[PDB]
Amino acid sequence: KLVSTQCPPLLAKEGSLVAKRAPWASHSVNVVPYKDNRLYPSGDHVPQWSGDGVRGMREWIGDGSENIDNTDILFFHTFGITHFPAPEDFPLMPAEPITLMLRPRHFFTENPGLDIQPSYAMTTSEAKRAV
Amino acid sequence: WVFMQDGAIRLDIRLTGILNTYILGDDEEAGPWGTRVYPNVNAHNHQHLFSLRIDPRIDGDGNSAAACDAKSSPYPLGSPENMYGNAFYSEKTTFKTVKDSLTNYESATGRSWDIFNPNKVNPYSGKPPSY
Ligand SMILES: [Cu+2]
């Protein structure tokens, strides 16, 4: 399970240069059918592309009708942050963190690290022994 | 009634004569319903409406009528189907029932109406013959 929360909406208007050259950025999630070499969402050769044309994500999405249920798929997740600069960021800025996670849910039948030697462990009976 | 050499038929009307007038007081305002076209004269607003009756036999018997509306493609700018957003077509709504025909001219679609013979086809365009 993708537990991601720093998912800013794309602030640039639809039809903008930004929105057109980064088709994948308009959604937090884009899922498409797998095909060999579907790696770069903004096209293979990115510099100076106007954003017009069926390539990258726009191409993989197509008319959005292809099946992605129980097949080989590709999951593209858009995450990041929106930076409104403050003097604290200057002249050198302190690290700003971004994170996302993929947790196993229903993958295992019980906590998988239970066989890792505990740092400390006292049983109820053992606690009685110690009196 | 005008007949032309391209096969078109046209009805031209010219309105002339004299305005219907009613009396207007010396200090009476023709208000919003009429115009003071001369001292003490009030020409009231009015409409001149005509009902053209057409009994068609477009290329024979068995005819139909339809409304024709110009429309932008339903697909948006930047989509594989309308990448530059210039796509547009003519939407034909053929009247099946009397009720369907009760229509008005719409500037928004540059509406026109077709009277055609659904029993025949133009060998080139594939559309039925029509006026
Ligand atoms: Cu920044």
Curated annotation (Swiss-Prot), chain A:
It comes from the Eukaryota. Topaquinone (TPQ) is generated by copper-dependent autoxidation of a specific tyrosyl residue. Cu cation binds at residue 83. Induction: By methylamine. It is found in: Peroxisome. Mn(2+) binds at residues 72-73. Belongs to the copper/topaquinone oxidase family. Homodimer. This is Peroxisomal primary amine oxidase. It comes from Pichia angusta. The chain holds residues 542 to 672 of 692 of the full protein.
Swiss-Prot record, chain B:
Induction: By methylamine. Signal peptide: none annotated. Cu cation binds at residues 46, 48. Transmembrane segments: none annotated. It comes from the Eukaryota. Coiled coil: none annotated. It is found in: Peroxisome. Topaquinone (TPQ) is generated by copper-dependent autoxidation of a specific tyrosyl residue. Mn(2+) binds at residue 55. Belongs to the copper/topaquinone oxidase family. Homodimer. This is Peroxisomal primary amine oxidase. It comes from Pichia angusta. The gene is AMO. The chain holds residues 411 to 541 of 692 of the full protein.
